[PDB]
Amino acid sequence: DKPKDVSSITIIPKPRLGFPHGKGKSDAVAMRVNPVALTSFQDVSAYPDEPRTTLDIARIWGLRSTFNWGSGDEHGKELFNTVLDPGLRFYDQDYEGQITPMEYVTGLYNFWSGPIELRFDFVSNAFHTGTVIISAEYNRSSTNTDECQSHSTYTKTFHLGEQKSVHFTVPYIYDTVVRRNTASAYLPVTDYDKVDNVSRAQAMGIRAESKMRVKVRVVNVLRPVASTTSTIEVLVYMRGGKNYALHGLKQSTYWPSNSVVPIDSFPPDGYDP
Amino acid sequence: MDTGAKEDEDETANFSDGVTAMGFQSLDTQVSIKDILRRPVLLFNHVELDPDYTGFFIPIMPPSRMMQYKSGDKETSFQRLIGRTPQAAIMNLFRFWRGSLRYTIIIHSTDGHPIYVTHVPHTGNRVYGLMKVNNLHEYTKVPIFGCGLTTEMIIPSVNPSICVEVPFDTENNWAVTFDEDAQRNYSWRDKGDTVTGHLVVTPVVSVYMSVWVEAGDDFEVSNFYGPPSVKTNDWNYAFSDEH
Amino acid sequence: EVPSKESIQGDATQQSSKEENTIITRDQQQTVSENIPSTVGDLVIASSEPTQQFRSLTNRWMPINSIRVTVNGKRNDLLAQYYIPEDFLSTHAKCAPNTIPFETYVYGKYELEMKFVANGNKFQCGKVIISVKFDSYQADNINTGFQAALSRPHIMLDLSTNNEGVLKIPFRYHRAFVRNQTHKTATAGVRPGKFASIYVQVLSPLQTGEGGANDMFIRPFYRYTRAEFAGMSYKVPLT
């Protein structure tokens, strides 16, 4: 017999399946003998200590900044002072150097939130002695000469001695649940074009510059013995907190600046000498 | 990877860790490395296919610093902002990758001519763009798609787009993501270990195409290298919130 | 772990590490990198014949060349670097019995342990970082900073306290085996004797007091925790 098929359905034709998404469904055709065969990860596979998320990379400690602390530095003096924004290191100048892991990966997202962790390693010995105060300042910032303004915020006083390192969680205290990135979502300028006001006026967005600052002031002046150095360097590490969050994938704010060469055809393009 | 909590010997009191913002705005989490690598990157934007050649070669490798544009260098067919994509930035941290890649190819046509996409396994070379294989001047009688290799056809009149998944047909355990200098003439077998093969597009008549790339479902990365030395000038091309 | 009161021989609360016919003591605490795995499963496929270990020879401590750190040295400066195993065969400690199996076998898998001992005085100060980069051939000049070192498996050395550092290095290579030796008859198409790089870098410059010493020294020691050799051949001189 050859009976008629009365079954039918309305359809909406699309060219690709799950093109925008990182997961879900795919209409990908395997270039294989067996169409459902896949790569084996029985022996060779990702090692368990390797990061699985961008948040895992953000949990790696990275050296952000350094500053000197000497016996000449009078009490109340700012040893360190920065806007602690993981979007941009500077708002008013170019950056070039080794950016921290948490800053690198945060540069890929339009939004960030959660506490930021700092660690201050004092490159000293047992004969160095002094006290500093670390302060997280929000909304309103303190004068350079007014230590009392810094003392009125969220502070941690560290007595330098036998212990030469101190940890500091910077609280997330803002009017919004997340903060948008100060870097651009998309920047088509590739050849260091001389900027004008018309270029800025036709930008992708407006930079919401952070007023949150972290400062380090002298409490007790550094008083080392005559036999050792009078000045020491302090290494400032940074990473995302345990509840650090990222969202809204965008154009990367940072890009490699060292040993960048585009690929050529090997061996056609003059490899045979 | 070294977290560095090892070095953190201080055990004094600290402020609260609080509560995560993950899930508050939406459940669309975008932190997974695999999820970031599985969304597509534009390689070639409206590039010509010419039937005088064997075909347009695409080397099977993920986006990275290898395909990064630098102001002043010679003009290539590649997209200039490949190096500034999220997944390129991620791949700059991992020098090993294993598994399949997926290539979305769109032919700028509505004609009934078939355009063939042939997979070449790891042969040891690394090329891209239009090439005359063995420098001949005729390839219609000896097409690459009819030599024996695995091939798929696009028929633009039906569908101008396709998504093809290329296997990990190589000798090595891992594929090398990047080198310090991509144009350096070093040990020739090591030179070719940055790819796992090629994808060759051959037309009937002259026509343009666009090419995207992403990671497959069966895909892994390893050999964490950490962040490199970088530069930015994003600040300069935007106004602040105080005019 | 805890110091004691002074006696005839000072504070006698030292620890030590004994491996084969070699012992290394330590006066203060040590920092140790995480024990992380190597590639396993490919060994039985890559080599049809069984692989061999020579623990008595390879798993002993062997010192290599001395490293000098000066006050002139800036952050990010390379104090020393080692392409392994190459540099432990034909550059450093060439007459070591650790190198004997590399003469005859052409292939191998190698997991290492590297101990670093510093000796700066109590009126000095500074920070040094040692890190490992797996499968580094033609990628030594990128991701090669102090920041990349802090991300990768590493150890940190304070130059005043003289804390010891132990870097545990697994075998993470894009092939099943690494080639041990180049030869005139062998191919030049494959770079042999390099599956990883070790970097010793200044994290914070060395500083000293008035009329103090302008330098101090660090000594690395190496050993194989798991050295499996494959493909027996006639013995050759190393490089």
Partner: peptide, 26 residues
């Protein structure tokens, strides 16, 4: 010619890469 092809003799080893002896590369 293309200067990326071959590394200068004073900084490099026989395998056309920076020598381990050459510390100043950084």
């Amino acid at each position: 010619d293309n200067p990326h092809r071959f590394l200068p003799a004073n900084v490099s080893n026989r395998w056309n890469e920076y020598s381990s002896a050459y510390l100043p590369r950084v």
